[PDB]
Amino acid sequence: EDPPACGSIVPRREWRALASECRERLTRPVRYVVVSHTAGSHCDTPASCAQQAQNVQSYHVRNLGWCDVGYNFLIGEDGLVYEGRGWNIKGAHAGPTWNPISIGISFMGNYMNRVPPPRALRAAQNLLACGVALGALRSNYEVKGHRDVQPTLSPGDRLYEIIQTWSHYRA
């Protein structure tokens, strides 16, 4: 297996995820990381956030027909990172141009009129940091916002502002 490490990720089974059915693999090492917000309900507790990860994947699978939840990872306001498709399966979160080359991470909540908690922001930079040590993320990765790659109000005005402060951020 993988003795409980990296960025404290809540595994798929722990948030009661329907089994993935995706097979498109992503080209390690990855250059881009796109940050989006789900624009759904936000939660703060491990209990409420697992239920939300479940709810997001369910909308992507039962309704949109996708092979699994779109994002490679979801960040809850509880400060935990939720495993979506992982570092190896091409996501689906920023269109055909970016899905095969960037890793998508999504903040659960609407951040148009709100900001995620520091802990959520920590879990997120931390998550990327742990990407690098695995080979999934190339040490000198670039971070784009959803707006920057596709006409979307995502990840929200207030969260978008913060994303720009980040070091690895490109234009």
Ligand X SMILES: CC(=O)N[C@@H]1[C@@H](O)[C@H](O[C@@H]2O[C@H](CO)[C@@H](O[C@@H]3O[C@H](CO)[C@@H](O)[C@H](O)[C@H]3NC(C)=O)[C@H](O)[C@H]2NC(C)=O)[C@@H](CO)O[C@H]1O
List strand residue ranges (DSSP E) for 64-136, in order.
73-75, 81-83, 102-107
Task: Tell me which of 48, 152, 166, 168 binds ligand X, using CB under 6 A.
Answer: 152
Task: Tell me which of 54, 115, 152, 169 binds a second copy, using CB under 8 A.
Answer: 152
Cβ–Cβ < 8 Å for 72, 118: no
The phi and psi torsions of 68 (rounded to 5 degrees) equal 180, 175
- Of ligand X, a second copy, none, which one sits near residue 121, judging by CB under 5 to 8 A according to partner kind? a second copy
Shortest spacing between CB 45 and a second copy, in angstroms: 4
| Alpha carbon distance 3, 165 (integer Å) | 33
Number of residues that bind ligand X (CB under 6 A): 8
Amino acid of residue 3: P
| Alpha carbon distance 80, 52 (integer Å) | 13
Binding site for a second copy (CB under 8 A): 1, 3-10, 14, 21, 23-24, 27, 31, 38-39, 44-47, 59-60, 63-65, 67, 70, 78-80, 93, 95-97, 100-101, 117-119, 121-123, 125-126, 129-130, 132-133, 135, 138-140, 148-153, 167, 170
